[PDB]
Design a protein around this ligand. Sequence first.
Ligand code: DDQ
Ligand code: CA
Length: 234
Amino acid sequence: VQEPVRRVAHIIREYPHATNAFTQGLVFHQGHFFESTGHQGTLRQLSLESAQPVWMERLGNIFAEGLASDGERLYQLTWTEGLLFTWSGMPPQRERTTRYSGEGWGLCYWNGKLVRSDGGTMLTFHEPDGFALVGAVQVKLRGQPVELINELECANGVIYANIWHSSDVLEIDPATGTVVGVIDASALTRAVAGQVTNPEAVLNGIAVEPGSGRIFMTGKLWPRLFEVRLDVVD
Ligand SMILES: CCCCCCCCCC[N+](C)(C)[O-]
Ligand SMILES: [Ca+2]
């Protein structure tokens, strides 16, 4: 038991993002870059050369939320609807609708399981086929539960998680819920501050590219998505 590692996200490069996209899910999938939005609900494939998506399916009034990939299918939560959409093929088409209890904030895939956050302190673990709960951990930083756990990303042996309305990103051990790292991504929030006005225009959305290990972060309604390098601070 030691101090969580402290890191600072250093902006490597910036790319256009759409200022009308409320980013709730962000993941790489079968060579492409995907985003889930609510208000209005969409699944979109992003270009890094333009804010205009290369492909989008509109979900109407459904408030879509976190988005996970197992390499073959995309899995997409909803906020209070209790709907999980499972997408397959290229372009993705929905092949399954699944009802679940509780709220859907972030989602990622780890060790054959979907890991789900709901804005509380808990990460719950679910079977991809039918979304039955199989386990849970409480997310704890220095032994203390952390509320507001939002978009997820399963990479590098951890779960990366946004904290809603914070510029910190946690690194969580999925076996235990222990926070093993805290990333300061406040340079990203500072970077867009002169351009965003909406109260909900907050850092959210982490995706790691499988083929390159390159790490990307954005925010709701942000004009930019950022590639970051995570530097240890001592
Ligand atoms: C112009 C007003 C925009 C209202 C936005 C409401 C965002 C709800 C976000 C919920 N969650 C944290 C669950 O996504
Ligand atoms: Ca993600």
